[PDB]
Design a protein around this ligand. Sequence first.
Ligand SMILES: Nc1ncnc2c1ncn2[C@@H]1O[C@H](COP(=O)(O)OC(=O)/C=C/C2=CCC(=O)C=C2)[C@@H](O)[C@H]1O
Ligand SMILES: [Mg+2]
Length: 529
Amino acid sequence: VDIIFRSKLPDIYIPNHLPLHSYCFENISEFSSRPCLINGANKQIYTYADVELNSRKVAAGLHKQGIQPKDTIMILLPNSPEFVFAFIGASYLGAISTMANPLFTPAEVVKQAKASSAKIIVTQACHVNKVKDYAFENDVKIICIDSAPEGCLHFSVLTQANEHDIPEVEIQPDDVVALPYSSGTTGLPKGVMLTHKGLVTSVAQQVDGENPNLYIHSEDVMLCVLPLFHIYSLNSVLLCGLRVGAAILIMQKFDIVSFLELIQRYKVTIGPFVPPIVLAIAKSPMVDDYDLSSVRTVMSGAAPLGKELEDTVRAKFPNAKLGQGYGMTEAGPVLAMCLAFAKEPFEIKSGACGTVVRNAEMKIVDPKTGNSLPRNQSGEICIRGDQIMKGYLNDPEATARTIDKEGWLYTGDIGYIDDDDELFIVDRLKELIKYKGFQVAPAELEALLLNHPNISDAAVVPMKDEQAGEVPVAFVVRSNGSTITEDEVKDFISKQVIFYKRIKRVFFVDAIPKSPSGKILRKDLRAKL
Ligand SMILES: Nc1ncnc2c1ncn2[C@@H]1O[C@H](COP(=O)(O)OC(=O)/C=C/C2=CCC(=O)C=C2)[C@@H](O)[C@H]1O
Ligand SMILES: [Mg+2]
């Protein structure tokens, strides 16, 4: 029998039959006039009424541009009001947003555009070159938020549409609304189908209930420095923020001065961070010149945090409850959330990544035997609930290997749950590398390396790094007679991938250690490194 773990919070009613926009704006009448989005770039403020109206206008505009229910748009933008309007606009149409890092290489953007069948790409003028040829050859519309080059439209073509022209639509709970990409537990990035039902469930698990797990209210100011094109910010900052009527303070890029100035100036109360930001707060001499006493909740997620950096937060944010959230794109994303963040807070331990969310089930499974494990025993973390993905787009085989027929998602993460129902992640079974919280799929890099005429075999694994958490490193077997150097391997990769996917070290070996099936012995390589 499976040994099942649950939240210390009771299950709540979740209205996950509601479309995502209907749910997130369910209580909008209570805070219609309140600030919703604050753009750090220009200090422009949109109210809740503004954001709902602009999203509806954009929905009508997208319809006019040919977006029908179940069609997909690609958002290729930094954090911005336009990102939000495009995302919520598509939701109103029963359509799908796929989201991508605007700093991706042309090849990376186009691969995702093709895989997702995006009909429109929403971007900035400076990135049109990345997609223009592909878009022309495939009649993909390009919409620019700043200025429109030839063969492109301006975003005003969407915002100038009449909100009353949103077509009648019957959106279903299992309809897809968001399509972030993730490599999951092995292989290449895949389209994660996140549904209305799924995202409503995930948001509710965090912010709804008499005692919400993550207590945020309509007088809070939440920093949005994490990228909205990744699921952590998209769900836990934007969607959760909207649901409770919080103000969301958007930053386009991290820089330490702007970060500190915005916190102090706007009296930021919620700080959703990742470990590199925590480390920057730890190290920067200028931090002591700022008043950070407004911050009442600091969360770290996306990568392990550690003890030294937890001490940093305590010292630098004297009024804050500090803790972690643990998510995975396929999981909706939140698996566990620090109960110190609750309206009636629970005691927590350092190094814990939270307690499994309410309205969900967790088990810990031994990879060797397949047996479910009791408390205080490490194994693979698995989760079950309405919040998880529908599956991978056009990839039932990968879906079947990732979520079983009893509804269990296998995370590829190793951890244990203690007597206080606190979850600790201790290792990663899956091949995924995390650079500053960003996914680096070694299979992608390995495919590139094997394409080189002078490389016989290759394996990409994480190496521990202070600044980035992990960096990708390559073990490379040179072809016979090859003299390819570390720098030459690095340059070959660097010309083809976004910065964070870059190989930081190459180790040249005679053979890549492999299992008798033909699979890389990655744990052995990590032990060596
Ligand atoms: N807290 C964590 N500690 C150790 N590791 C963590 C943690 N959170 C995520 N990870 C790692 O990233 C993987 C998931 O990567 P992915 O990019 O798909 O998703 C994410 O990283 C999402 C994280 C997140 C979302 C919402 C939120 O509120 C708090 C955190 C996990 O399987 C695990 O290996
Ligand atoms: Mg319906």
